[PDB]
mmCIF file of C-alpha atoms in Angstrom:
data_model
loop_
_atom_site.group_PDB
_atom_site.id
_atom_site.type_symbol
_atom_site.label_atom_id
_atom_site.label_comp_id
_atom_site.label_asym_id
_atom_site.label_seq_id
_atom_site.Cartn_x
_atom_site.Cartn_y
_atom_site.Cartn_z
ATOM 1 C CA UNK A 64 -7.106 -3.855 -22.555
ATOM 2 C CA UNK A 65 -9.945 -5.590 -20.730
ATOM 3 C CA UNK A 66 -12.867 -6.585 -22.949
ATOM 4 C CA UNK A 67 -15.273 -8.990 -21.260
ATOM 5 C CA UNK A 68 -19.029 -9.635 -21.387
ATOM 6 C CA UNK A 69 -21.213 -10.357 -18.360
ATOM 7 C CA UNK A 70 -24.841 -11.465 -18.332
ATOM 8 C CA UNK A 71 -27.036 -9.142 -16.273
ATOM 9 C CA UNK A 72 -29.537 -10.576 -13.792
ATOM 10 C CA UNK A 73 -31.791 -7.605 -13.001
ATOM 11 C CA UNK A 74 -35.454 -8.598 -13.316
ATOM 12 C CA UNK A 75 -37.500 -5.699 -11.926
ATOM 13 C CA UNK A 76 -38.789 -3.646 -14.873
ATOM 14 C CA UNK A 77 -39.975 -4.645 -18.341
ATOM 15 C CA UNK A 78 -37.023 -2.726 -19.776
ATOM 16 C CA UNK A 79 -34.781 -4.847 -17.545
ATOM 17 C CA UNK A 80 -36.265 -7.893 -19.319
ATOM 18 C CA UNK A 81 -35.309 -6.547 -22.778
ATOM 19 C CA UNK A 82 -31.587 -6.889 -21.978
ATOM 20 C CA UNK A 83 -29.150 -9.793 -22.347
ATOM 21 C CA UNK A 84 -25.658 -8.952 -21.062
ATOM 22 C CA UNK A 85 -23.090 -6.199 -20.503
ATOM 23 C CA UNK A 86 -19.999 -5.956 -22.709
ATOM 24 C CA UNK A 87 -17.345 -4.316 -20.535
ATOM 25 C CA UNK A 88 -14.437 -2.474 -22.181
ATOM 26 C CA UNK A 89 -11.878 -0.047 -20.749
ATOM 27 C CA UNK A 90 -8.253 1.025 -21.140
ATOM 28 C CA UNK A 91 -5.673 3.215 -19.379
ATOM 29 C CA UNK A 92 -4.138 6.277 -21.009
ATOM 30 C CA UNK A 93 -1.429 8.172 -19.113
ATOM 31 C CA UNK A 94 1.150 6.772 -16.700
ATOM 32 C CA UNK A 95 3.547 8.803 -14.571
ATOM 33 C CA UNK A 96 5.709 8.124 -11.527
ATOM 34 C CA UNK A 97 6.916 10.933 -9.258
ATOM 35 C CA UNK A 98 9.525 11.064 -6.518
ATOM 36 C CA UNK A 99 8.717 9.692 -3.042
ATOM 37 C CA UNK A 100 6.697 12.076 -0.909
ATOM 38 C CA UNK A 101 5.617 12.608 2.695
ATOM 39 C CA UNK A 102 2.474 13.887 4.411
ATOM 40 C CA UNK A 103 3.993 15.802 7.401
ATOM 41 C CA UNK A 104 0.561 15.791 9.157
ATOM 42 C CA UNK A 105 -0.690 19.324 8.622
ATOM 43 C CA UNK A 106 -3.500 18.737 6.066
ATOM 44 C CA UNK A 107 -1.588 20.410 3.243
ATOM 45 C CA UNK A 108 0.189 19.103 0.146
ATOM 46 C CA UNK A 109 2.796 16.323 0.043
ATOM 47 C CA UNK A 110 6.438 17.089 0.867
ATOM 48 C CA UNK A 111 9.631 15.379 -0.272
ATOM 49 C CA UNK A 112 10.487 12.135 1.531
ATOM 50 C CA UNK A 113 14.228 11.663 2.055
ATOM 51 C CA UNK A 114 15.769 8.169 2.376
ATOM 52 C CA UNK A 115 17.036 8.698 5.924
ATOM 53 C CA UNK A 116 13.537 9.713 7.045
ATOM 54 C CA UNK A 117 12.179 6.446 5.627
ATOM 55 C CA UNK A 118 14.964 4.526 7.371
ATOM 56 C CA UNK A 119 14.332 6.095 10.776
ATOM 57 C CA UNK A 120 10.523 6.202 10.659
ATOM 58 C CA UNK A 121 10.000 2.739 9.184
ATOM 59 C CA UNK A 122 8.375 4.136 6.043
ATOM 60 C CA UNK A 123 8.666 2.968 2.426
ATOM 61 C CA UNK A 124 10.603 4.928 -0.198
ATOM 62 C CA UNK A 125 7.732 4.554 -2.654
ATOM 63 C CA UNK A 126 6.888 7.100 -5.326
ATOM 64 C CA UNK A 127 3.326 7.842 -6.415
ATOM 65 C CA UNK A 128 2.062 6.399 -9.695
ATOM 66 C CA UNK A 129 -0.514 8.508 -11.540
ATOM 67 C CA UNK A 130 -2.908 6.989 -14.078
ATOM 68 C CA UNK A 131 -5.683 7.994 -16.451
ATOM 69 C CA UNK A 132 -8.408 5.764 -17.861
ATOM 70 C CA UNK A 133 -11.171 5.554 -20.458
ATOM 71 C CA UNK A 134 -14.376 3.567 -19.943
ATOM 72 C CA UNK A 135 -16.447 2.510 -22.970
ATOM 73 C CA UNK A 136 -19.240 0.054 -22.153
ATOM 74 C CA UNK A 137 -21.685 -1.683 -24.490
ATOM 75 C CA UNK A 138 -25.308 -2.654 -23.838
ATOM 76 C CA UNK A 139 -26.800 -5.729 -25.513
ATOM 77 C CA UNK A 140 -30.550 -6.247 -25.829
ATOM 78 C CA UNK A 141 -32.642 -9.326 -26.606
ATOM 79 C CA UNK A 142 -33.180 -8.518 -30.286
ATOM 80 C CA UNK A 143 -29.600 -7.711 -31.274
ATOM 81 C CA UNK A 144 -29.201 -3.945 -30.900
ATOM 82 C CA UNK A 145 -26.297 -2.323 -29.058
ATOM 83 C CA UNK A 146 -25.857 0.758 -26.865
ATOM 84 C CA UNK A 147 -22.403 2.234 -26.225
ATOM 85 C CA UNK A 148 -21.576 4.738 -23.470
ATOM 86 C CA UNK A 149 -18.244 6.489 -22.931
ATOM 87 C CA UNK A 150 -16.483 7.923 -19.889
ATOM 88 C CA UNK A 151 -13.345 10.040 -19.558
ATOM 89 C CA UNK A 152 -11.419 10.014 -16.275
ATOM 90 C CA UNK A 153 -8.870 12.707 -15.324
ATOM 91 C CA UNK A 154 -5.462 11.773 -13.863
ATOM 92 C CA UNK A 155 -5.745 9.599 -10.770
ATOM 93 C CA UNK A 156 -3.160 8.143 -8.369
ATOM 94 C CA UNK A 157 -3.377 4.345 -8.537
ATOM 95 C CA UNK A 158 -0.690 3.452 -5.988
ATOM 96 C CA UNK A 159 2.946 3.848 -4.975
ATOM 97 C CA UNK A 160 5.862 2.046 -6.623
ATOM 98 C CA UNK A 161 9.102 1.307 -4.737
ATOM 99 C CA UNK A 162 11.994 3.490 -5.863
ATOM 100 C CA UNK A 163 15.628 2.403 -6.147
ATOM 101 C CA UNK A 164 18.269 4.484 -4.390
ATOM 102 C CA UNK A 165 20.636 6.272 -6.740
ATOM 103 C CA UNK A 166 18.087 6.077 -9.561
ATOM 104 C CA UNK A 167 16.606 8.884 -11.649
ATOM 105 C CA UNK A 168 13.437 9.142 -9.523
ATOM 106 C CA UNK A 169 15.421 9.299 -6.255
ATOM 107 C CA UNK A 170 16.063 12.525 -4.374
ATOM 108 C CA UNK A 171 19.790 11.703 -4.220
ATOM 109 C CA UNK A 172 20.263 12.210 -7.959
ATOM 110 C CA UNK A 173 20.571 16.002 -8.305
ATOM 111 C CA UNK A 174 22.495 16.183 -5.005
ATOM 112 C CA UNK A 175 26.276 16.325 -5.037
ATOM 113 C CA UNK A 176 28.671 14.730 -2.560
ATOM 114 C CA UNK A 177 28.537 17.675 -0.150
ATOM 115 C CA UNK A 178 24.735 17.802 -0.334
ATOM 116 C CA UNK A 179 24.401 14.033 0.177
ATOM 117 C CA UNK A 180 26.745 14.305 3.162
ATOM 118 C CA UNK A 181 24.742 17.245 4.517
ATOM 119 C CA UNK A 182 21.316 15.581 4.324
ATOM 120 C CA UNK A 183 22.375 12.421 6.165
ATOM 121 C CA UNK A 184 23.444 10.020 3.416
ATOM 122 C CA UNK A 185 26.560 7.954 2.775
ATOM 123 C CA UNK A 186 28.347 10.151 0.201
ATOM 124 C CA UNK A 187 30.398 7.224 -1.124
ATOM 125 C CA UNK B 436 -6.453 -7.421 -7.096
ATOM 126 C CA UNK B 437 -7.391 -4.951 -9.836
ATOM 127 C CA UNK B 438 -9.359 -6.432 -12.737
ATOM 128 C CA UNK B 439 -11.119 -9.151 -10.724
ATOM 129 C CA UNK B 440 -12.307 -6.696 -8.019
ATOM 130 C CA UNK B 441 -13.595 -4.503 -10.860
ATOM 131 C CA UNK B 442 -15.414 -7.502 -12.347
ATOM 132 C CA UNK B 443 -17.001 -8.451 -9.025
ATOM 133 C CA UNK B 444 -17.947 -4.839 -8.307
ATOM 134 C CA UNK B 445 -19.631 -4.633 -11.701
ATOM 135 C CA UNK B 446 -21.389 -7.936 -10.938
ATOM 136 C CA UNK B 447 -22.747 -6.496 -7.690
ATOM 137 C CA UNK B 448 -23.637 -3.167 -9.330
ATOM 138 C CA UNK B 449 -25.625 -5.149 -11.888
ATOM 139 C CA UNK B 450 -27.015 -7.285 -9.052
ATOM 140 C CA UNK B 451 -28.620 -4.218 -7.400
ATOM 141 C CA UNK B 452 -28.930 -1.344 -9.897
ATOM 142 C CA UNK B 453 -30.673 -1.697 -13.251
ATOM 143 C CA UNK B 454 -28.368 -1.397 -16.254
ATOM 144 C CA UNK B 455 -30.782 0.734 -18.304
ATOM 145 C CA UNK B 456 -31.080 3.163 -15.373
ATOM 146 C CA UNK B 457 -27.283 3.328 -15.027
ATOM 147 C CA UNK B 458 -25.635 6.500 -16.320
ATOM 148 C CA UNK B 459 -22.055 7.765 -16.455
ATOM 149 C CA UNK B 460 -22.235 8.735 -12.773
ATOM 150 C CA UNK B 461 -22.994 5.145 -11.734
ATOM 151 C CA UNK B 462 -20.236 3.858 -14.026
ATOM 152 C CA UNK B 463 -17.722 6.156 -12.323
ATOM 153 C CA UNK B 464 -19.079 5.236 -8.896
ATOM 154 C CA UNK B 465 -18.765 1.511 -9.617
ATOM 155 C CA UNK B 466 -15.222 1.883 -10.954
ATOM 156 C CA UNK B 467 -14.185 3.964 -7.934
ATOM 157 C CA UNK B 468 -15.813 1.502 -5.517
ATOM 158 C CA UNK B 469 -13.981 -1.404 -7.155
ATOM 159 C CA UNK B 470 -10.712 0.483 -6.459
ATOM 160 C CA UNK B 471 -11.040 1.067 -2.700
ATOM 161 C CA UNK B 472 -8.398 0.613 0.008
ATOM 162 C CA UNK B 473 -8.909 -3.166 0.022
ATOM 163 C CA UNK B 474 -7.513 -3.660 -3.487
ATOM 164 C CA UNK B 475 -4.552 -1.323 -2.962
ATOM 165 C CA UNK B 476 -3.699 -2.987 0.350
ATOM 166 C CA UNK B 477 -4.020 -6.466 -1.167
ATOM 167 C CA UNK B 478 -1.779 -5.604 -4.126
ATOM 168 C CA UNK B 479 0.935 -3.836 -2.119
ATOM 169 C CA UNK B 480 0.947 -6.455 0.646
ATOM 170 C CA UNK B 481 1.158 -9.272 -1.915
ATOM 171 C CA UNK B 482 3.985 -7.643 -3.889
ATOM 172 C CA UNK B 483 6.056 -6.861 -0.795
ATOM 173 C CA UNK B 484 5.373 -10.282 0.717
ATOM 174 C CA UNK B 485 6.598 -11.751 -2.581
ATOM 175 C CA UNK B 486 9.801 -9.684 -2.634
ATOM 176 C CA UNK B 487 10.638 -10.414 1.005
ATOM 177 C CA UNK B 488 9.703 -14.120 0.872
ATOM 178 C CA UNK B 489 11.688 -14.500 -2.365
#
């Protein structure tokens, strides 16, 4: 939960002279991680990325991490009055997190031994 | 490579655009600019370099 205050150095308008600093505040709301995915190069949606494909292509078996955020900033003037603005952000993919094989977020979790053998994995 | 880029991006947003003229659009634009490909690349490269270096 970042909460920091930064002095502003904008000196163009008289209103810009009536200000002291910016009190920055924001927090993150929703976190989700989904199974690793591939692009397939057709300008569509993202398709499942299997471990053998990542092995052969030199990819990373990383699953997307989705985040939400809330921005509430505060404006300080010279006299001592405060202005607060708020911002709501919809879900947004921050990055990809590496995924462990055999884990719950891996593709080889619903698969049985025959399916794992069929898709190119070591079934044992 | 997340909070410090956001801080510096806010510093540069304040260093060009007036704060009283800023609205929610400029707040979103500054936050999204502070989260460009540079920060994601820095964070992922640093984490993987850490895991593989030990």
